[PDB]
Design an enzyme around this catalytic site. Structure first.
Site, PDB file in Angstrom:
ATOM      1  N   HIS A  46      27.156 -50.901  -4.418  1.00  0.00           N
ATOM      2  CA  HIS A  46      27.145 -51.707  -3.219  1.00  0.00           C
ATOM      3  C   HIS A  46      26.080 -51.329  -2.251  1.00  0.00           C
ATOM      4  O   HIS A  46      25.663 -50.170  -2.204  1.00  0.00           O
ATOM      5  CB  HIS A  46      28.427 -51.505  -2.468  1.00  0.00           C
ATOM      6  CG  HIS A  46      29.631 -51.487  -3.334  1.00  0.00           C
ATOM      7  ND1 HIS A  46      30.447 -50.390  -3.434  1.00  0.00           N
ATOM      8  CD2 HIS A  46      30.150 -52.429  -4.147  1.00  0.00           C
ATOM      9  CE1 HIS A  46      31.425 -50.660  -4.274  1.00  0.00           C
ATOM     10  NE2 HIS A  46      31.268 -51.893  -4.721  1.00  0.00           N
ATOM     11  N   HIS A  48      25.679 -50.709   1.526  1.00  0.00           N
ATOM     12  CA  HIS A  48      26.516 -50.404   2.671  1.00  0.00           C
ATOM     13  C   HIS A  48      25.710 -50.679   3.906  1.00  0.00           C
ATOM     14  O   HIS A  48      24.511 -50.808   3.821  1.00  0.00           O
ATOM     15  CB  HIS A  48      26.969 -48.942   2.659  1.00  0.00           C
ATOM     16  CG  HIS A  48      27.958 -48.612   1.576  1.00  0.00           C
ATOM     17  ND1 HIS A  48      29.168 -48.005   1.831  1.00  0.00           N
ATOM     18  CD2 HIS A  48      27.904 -48.796   0.237  1.00  0.00           C
ATOM     19  CE1 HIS A  48      29.821 -47.845   0.697  1.00  0.00           C
ATOM     20  NE2 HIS A  48      29.075 -48.314  -0.285  1.00  0.00           N
ATOM     21  N   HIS A  63      30.979 -51.136   3.583  1.00  0.00           N
ATOM     22  CA  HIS A  63      30.195 -52.117   2.873  1.00  0.00           C
ATOM     23  C   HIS A  63      29.512 -53.038   3.845  1.00  0.00           C
ATOM     24  O   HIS A  63      30.085 -53.415   4.856  1.00  0.00           O
ATOM     25  CB  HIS A  63      31.096 -52.959   1.990  1.00  0.00           C
ATOM     26  CG  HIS A  63      31.619 -52.228   0.803  1.00  0.00           C
ATOM     27  ND1 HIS A  63      31.768 -52.832  -0.424  1.00  0.00           N
ATOM     28  CD2 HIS A  63      32.006 -50.941   0.645  1.00  0.00           C
ATOM     29  CE1 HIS A  63      32.236 -51.952  -1.287  1.00  0.00           C
ATOM     30  NE2 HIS A  63      32.386 -50.795  -0.665  1.00  0.00           N
ATOM     31  N   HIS A  71      36.656 -57.751   0.775  1.00  0.00           N
ATOM     32  CA  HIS A  71      35.851 -57.273  -0.352  1.00  0.00           C
ATOM     33  C   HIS A  71      36.084 -58.173  -1.564  1.00  0.00           C
ATOM     34  O   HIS A  71      37.147 -58.765  -1.707  1.00  0.00           O
ATOM     35  CB  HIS A  71      36.168 -55.798  -0.667  1.00  0.00           C
ATOM     36  CG  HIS A  71      35.456 -55.262  -1.875  1.00  0.00           C
ATOM     37  ND1 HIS A  71      34.120 -54.931  -1.876  1.00  0.00           N
ATOM     38  CD2 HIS A  71      35.908 -54.988  -3.120  1.00  0.00           C
ATOM     39  CE1 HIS A  71      33.778 -54.492  -3.074  1.00  0.00           C
ATOM     40  NE2 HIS A  71      34.845 -54.516  -3.847  1.00  0.00           N
ATOM     41  N   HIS A  80      31.919 -59.336   0.320  1.00  0.00           N
ATOM     42  CA  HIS A  80      30.982 -58.753   1.249  1.00  0.00           C
ATOM     43  C   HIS A  80      29.600 -59.073   0.742  1.00  0.00           C
ATOM     44  O   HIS A  80      29.363 -59.076  -0.460  1.00  0.00           O
ATOM     45  CB  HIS A  80      31.166 -57.238   1.344  1.00  0.00           C
ATOM     46  CG  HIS A  80      32.501 -56.821   1.859  1.00  0.00           C
ATOM     47  ND1 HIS A  80      33.001 -55.556   1.671  1.00  0.00           N
ATOM     48  CD2 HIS A  80      33.429 -57.494   2.573  1.00  0.00           C
ATOM     49  CE1 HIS A  80      34.181 -55.463   2.255  1.00  0.00           C
ATOM     50  NE2 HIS A  80      34.465 -56.629   2.806  1.00  0.00           N
ATOM     51  N   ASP A  83      28.456 -56.614  -1.859  1.00  0.00           N
ATOM     52  CA  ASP A  83      29.276 -56.322  -3.039  1.00  0.00           C
ATOM     53  C   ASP A  83      28.576 -56.753  -4.298  1.00  0.00           C
ATOM     54  O   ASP A  83      28.661 -57.884  -4.666  1.00  0.00           O
ATOM     55  CB  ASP A  83      30.630 -57.027  -2.991  1.00  0.00           C
ATOM     56  CG  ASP A  83      31.503 -56.560  -1.861  1.00  0.00           C
ATOM     57  OD1 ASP A  83      31.420 -55.408  -1.427  1.00  0.00           O
ATOM     58  OD2 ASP A  83      32.321 -57.347  -1.392  1.00  0.00           O
ATOM     59  N   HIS A 120      29.138 -45.417  -7.126  1.00  0.00           N
ATOM     60  CA  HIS A 120      30.436 -44.806  -6.842  1.00  0.00           C
ATOM     61  C   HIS A 120      31.098 -44.135  -8.021  1.00  0.00           C
ATOM     62  O   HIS A 120      30.724 -44.346  -9.178  1.00  0.00           O
ATOM     63  CB  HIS A 120      31.401 -45.862  -6.361  1.00  0.00           C
ATOM     64  CG  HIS A 120      31.172 -46.307  -4.960  1.00  0.00           C
ATOM     65  ND1 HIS A 120      31.996 -45.927  -3.932  1.00  0.00           N
ATOM     66  CD2 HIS A 120      30.253 -47.141  -4.421  1.00  0.00           C
ATOM     67  CE1 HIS A 120      31.587 -46.499  -2.815  1.00  0.00           C
ATOM     68  NE2 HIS A 120      30.524 -47.234  -3.084  1.00  0.00           N
ATOM     69  N   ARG A 143      31.465 -41.354  -3.154  1.00  0.00           N
ATOM     70  CA  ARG A 143      30.118 -41.853  -3.167  1.00  0.00           C
ATOM     71  C   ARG A 143      29.219 -40.896  -3.910  1.00  0.00           C
ATOM     72  O   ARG A 143      28.682 -39.983  -3.341  1.00  0.00           O
ATOM     73  CB  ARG A 143      29.667 -42.066  -1.718  1.00  0.00           C
ATOM     74  CG  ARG A 143      30.614 -42.966  -0.946  1.00  0.00           C
ATOM     75  CD  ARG A 143      30.149 -43.265   0.463  1.00  0.00           C
ATOM     76  NE  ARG A 143      30.879 -44.403   1.030  1.00  0.00           N
ATOM     77  CZ  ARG A 143      30.726 -44.878   2.263  1.00  0.00           C
ATOM     78  NH1 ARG A 143      29.877 -44.319   3.103  1.00  0.00           N
ATOM     79  NH2 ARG A 143      31.434 -45.912   2.664  1.00  0.00           N
TER      80      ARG A 143
HETATM   81 CU   LIG Z   1      30.786 -48.970  -1.870  1.00  0.00          CU
HETATM   82 ZN   LIG Z   2      32.689 -54.719  -0.342  1.00  0.00          ZN
END
Ligand SMILES: [Cu+2]
Ligand SMILES: [Zn+2]
Ligand SMILES: [Cu+2]
Ligand SMILES: [Zn+2]
Lengths: 153, 153
Positions: A46, A48, A63, A71, A80, A83, A120, A143
């Protein structure tokens, strides 16, 4: 900004380089590159909100979500902006990333330049985990590696 | 983008964090923070064109120079958008950065978000070194530490 790039690093052994290309203003964006040091299988992926790496990857914040949606997966409608769903690791823990996406942009107010890209611990569940956390991080977990997204030659 | 931030890192022991704030659109930009691990004295300090850290700091490319000018000092009139001149190190090799500048911007087409900030081996000579190299890098020398500039909370 036609092109961009991002070097992913972290405390882990995880690391890679990911490129971006948006041939057309407000068109789609090819995202590709390669990450290594991953557990075989799926991993969340993602953009962020922040280009902050003051305190490792946690500084990046949540995010990237400028329209305040829940999400979701990248092809989902409720998602998002940041995403991009998942990427897939080898037996050998190399993930060969390759994605088109037209929610994100390198120009406009979905511009992701200057924001952190993050890979992730576990799979993104694409919002379908039915738990509180799934509509936020997709239960993607901690993360593993990250880096700020920058303007590329 | 009102605020931004950038973490400087390198092969050396040099490292620091630098913040940016532009309270007014197209106004001036306060730049402050702190870097450590420097040789006492002056050190060149620039925004370079690219957010590329593929091959360490060299990937950043030349000074951010969108109007195709010759290198200069920050208060000079003939200068690169990215020429913030110098920063000053302690006895102890800590430099306490603090600068206003209104050539750079966090918005507009002087936007420096997504570009690499770099601190250098020696002093920037502000273009006045009379050699070929002085109208390009200010003879600032190699690239001790750097990082991409990103959107801060
Ligand atoms: Cu993330
Ligand atoms: Zn998200
Ligand atoms: Cu330089
Ligand atoms: Zn310059």
């Amino acid at each position: 900004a036609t092109k961009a790039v991002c070097v992913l690093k972290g405390d882990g052994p995880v690391q890679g380089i990911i490129n971006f290309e948006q041939k057309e203003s407000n068109g789609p964006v090819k995202v590709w590159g390669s990450i290594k040091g991953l557990t075989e299988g799926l991993h969340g992926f993602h953009v962020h909100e922040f280009g902050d790496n003051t305190a490792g990857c946690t500084s990046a914040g949540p995010h990237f979500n400028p329209l305040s949606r829940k999400h979701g997966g990248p092809k989902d409608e409720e998602r998002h902006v940041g995403d991009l769903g998942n990427v897939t690791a080898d037996k050998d823990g190399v993930a060969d990333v390759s994605i088109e996406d037209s929610v994100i942009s390198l120009s406009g107010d979905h511009c992701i330049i200057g924001r952190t890209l993050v890979v992730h611990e576990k799979a993104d569940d694409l919002g379908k985990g039915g738990n509180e956390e799934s509509t936020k991080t997709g239960n993607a977990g901690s993360r593993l590696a990250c880096g700020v997204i920058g303007i590329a030659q």
